[PDB]
Structures are given as structure tokens and as C-alpha cells.
Amino acid sequence: MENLKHIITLGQVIHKRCEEMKYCKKQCRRLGHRVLGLIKPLEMLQDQGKRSVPSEKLTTAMNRFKAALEEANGEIEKFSNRSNICRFLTASQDKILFKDVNRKLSDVWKELSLLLQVEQRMPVSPISQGASWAQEDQQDADEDRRAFQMLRRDNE
Numbered sequence: 760m761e762n763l764k765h766i767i768t769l770g771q772v773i774h775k776r777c778e779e780m781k782y783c784k785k786q787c788r789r790l791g792h793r794v795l796g797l798i799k800p801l802e803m804l805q806d807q808g809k810r811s812v813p814s815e816k817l818t819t820a821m822n823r824f825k826a827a828l829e830e831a832n833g834e835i836e837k838f839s840n841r842s843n844i845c846r847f848l849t850a851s852q853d854k855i856l857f858k859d860v861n862r863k864l865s866d867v868w869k870e871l872s873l874l875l876q877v878e879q880r881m882p883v884s885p886i887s888q889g890a891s892w893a894q895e896d897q898q899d900a901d902e903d904r905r906a907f908q909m910l911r912r913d914n915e
Contacts, residue, residue, distance in 0.1 A: 760809060770794045794864075830859075
């Protein structure tokens with residue numbers, strides 16, 4: 760459907776433009792990991808034929824997801840300068856670029872996968888669930904923000 764297709768479009772574009780980040784590699788890979796694991800299932804469901812009957816839950820679910828991906832799109836478009844990333848990073852108390860934004864991706868996905876497997880009966884989770892993603896961003900962006908500032912590893 761329309762709003763769902765906007766999530767899919769945002770997703771593929773997000774992954775694509777995110778791959779310009781030579782700094783914040785693991786957060787670029789983690790954003791890519793999530794986004795691809797999100798869009799591909801719902802694409803294959805849209806492909807086989809997604810039933811035209813969006814409940815209050817399904818409307819809000821696709822709107823929350825779209826909006827979350829709209830945030831992610833705006834962030835990488837703003838992170839088109841890696842020097843700009845470092846400018847906010849050296850002041851950023853959290854060690855995650857997409858802390859807020861990608862937290863929305865985590866929440867709306869876990870809630871999606873729930874309402875899907877319960878009422879739609881559709882057990883879409885080619886990854887885990889989406890709740891454990893709090894630990895994912897924690898450890899991986901801890902390492903990668905540290906790997907931004909202390910990047911001597913990829914220097915001979």
C-alpha cells in the first residue's frame with residue numbers, strides 16, 4: 760500500500776546514501792543491517808499481495824515506521840559531511856548518531872512484528888524480534904564512536 764511503499768522507498772534510499780559514511784562505519788552497517796531486515800520482508804509481502812484492509816494498528820504502525828525512516832533519511836543527508844558528524848560528536852553525550860531516530864526504528868519494528876504475528880498471524884522476524892536492538896546500538900555505537908575519535912587502526 761501507499762504509506763507502506765513510502766517506508767520501502769525511504770529504506771532503500773537510506774541504505775544507499777548511508778554508504779557515503781567513511782567515518783561511523785559500524786553505525787552505517789548497523790543502520791543498513793536494520794533497514795534491509797525491515798524493508799525486504801514487507802516488500803516480499805507487498806509482492807505476493809498485501810491485503811487492502813489497514814486496521815487502526817496497521818495505519819499507525821506504517822505511519823510510525825515511515826516517520827522514523829523520514830528521520831533516518833534526514834540524519835544521513837545532514838551527515839553528508841563526516842567533519843560535521845565529528846563537530847556534533849565531540850559534544851554528543853550519547854555515543855550513537857541515530858540514538859533517538861533509530862530507537863523509533865527499534866520500537867515500531869518490535870511492535871510491528873507483534874501486531875503482525877498476533878492478528879495478521881504473520882510471523883515476520885528474519886532477524887530476532889527487534890527489542891534486543893537496544894543492546895545492538897549500545898555496544899556497536901560505543902565501539903564505533905570510539906572508533907571515530909580513536910581511528911588510528913585504518914592508518915597504516
